[PDB]
Amino acid sequence: GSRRYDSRTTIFSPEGRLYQVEYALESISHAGTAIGIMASDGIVLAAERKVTSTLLEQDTSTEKLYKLNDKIAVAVAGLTADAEILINTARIHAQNYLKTYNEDIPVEILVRRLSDIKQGYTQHGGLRPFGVSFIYAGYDDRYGYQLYTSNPSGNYTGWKAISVGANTSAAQTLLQMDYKDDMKVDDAIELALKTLSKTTDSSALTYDRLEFATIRKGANDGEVYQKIFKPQEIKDILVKTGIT
């Protein structure tokens, strides 16, 4: 028979742990670090492109920051390809909600959906889990700004500031040290850059190895705006905060 070659990706360990999930998490832990910090007037998503080259095109890229909705975006940590499969189903779910209720999908409803999908690969199907962790940054008129996180297990939680990928422990301690409830978006933009700058496994923290995005509610308007910083804008924000 075939039973011989079956890994049995969905079984419990004698300790009651999910082998594949724990191993997927171990995988995520070697991926570029991504930070998510929520201010009083916005949210900041920052990510470190793990490994690069001189020829790698930084302009025609967006390997870790993806726009889900017009009010929701995510930072990725893990298999880009796996992430794209989940992201796409997520973009579809948002639109079905919009077509059904003629209202944008509340941030948590979208995060729960995706997590449930992940949870499935955990309880049946005999397929390997998705080696991906997301940091969700979004807004809606019920909870305003929200920050979330979901991992291979299918679990998700909310944060004021959080990180995924490598050196999360060090980064979470630094964040838990200088974060403050009243923080303003630009303060957060700075905390994020500092945190990555102290956990990086690289020499310097140049602009070509970074991705930045902010969901601010531009005072001059009355609605929410998503802005994925361009190579240049990241270069600037890097000089100002004093890292040249």
Binding site: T100, Y101, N102, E103, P106, D141, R142
Partner: protein, 198 residues
């Protein structure tokens, strides 16, 4: 057919629905409530095919209550109506379509404004000051076009209806055995148990 009227005044929505249920040659019941409460601040009245009518309402009610529990939140009247339209628009091209017309009236606690939605069995939705399904409109729309004012009080609204119902009791061939009236406002849904002689 049945009478299904709805009028949106200053701070509430009023739904009037006939009480008669006629099966062939006889009037089986004279106290039928052609309505369902989709949520604490949203009410839906309906008229149409014999079985499809209640089956559809209860199906819609069930889904809205499930959403409320899952999310611990009450969908806006606009959201509920868009959901209901989609349901009707789906069944119109199915094997056996629900032949049901509805009026959805709710009070949007977030905008603090009453709203009235009219949707026919085809999934045709329109938002109105006052609406009606079937033949009801033919007798009443001229009265409403005339006397309707956006700032009417719930009281002025109940008087405008009373007038509408009287024109209906005069010129319409069928005895619809009066109506049941309900008000939807910032405080929920209540029934004017005295319109039989208000």
């Amino acid at each position: 057919m049945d009478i299904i009227l709805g009028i949106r005044v200053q701070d509430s929505v009023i739904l009037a629905s006939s009480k008669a249920v006629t099966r062939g040659i006889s009037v089986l019941k004279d106290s039928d409530d052609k309505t369902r409460q989709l949520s604490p601040h949203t009410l839906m009245s309906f008229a149409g095919e014999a079985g499809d009518t209640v089956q559809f309402a209860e199906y819609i009610q069930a889904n809205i209550q499930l959403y409320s529990i899952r999310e611990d939140y009450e969908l806006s009247p606009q959201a509920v109506s868009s959901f209901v339209r989609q349901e009707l628009a789906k069944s119109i091209r199915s094997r056996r379509p629900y032949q049901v017309n509805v009026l959805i009236g709710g009070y949007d606690k977030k905008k603090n404004k009453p709203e009235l939605y009219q949707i026919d069995y085809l999934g045709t939705k329109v938002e109105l000051p006052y609406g009606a399904h079937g033949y009801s409109g033919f007798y009443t729309f001229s009265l409403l076009d005339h006397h309707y004012r956006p700032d009417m009080t719930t009281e002025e609204g109940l008087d405008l209806l009373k007038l509408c119902v009287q024109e209906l009791e005069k010129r319409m061939p069928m005895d619809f055995k009066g109506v049941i009236v309900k008000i939807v406002d910032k405080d929920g849904i209540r029934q004017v148990d005295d319109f039989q002689a208000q």
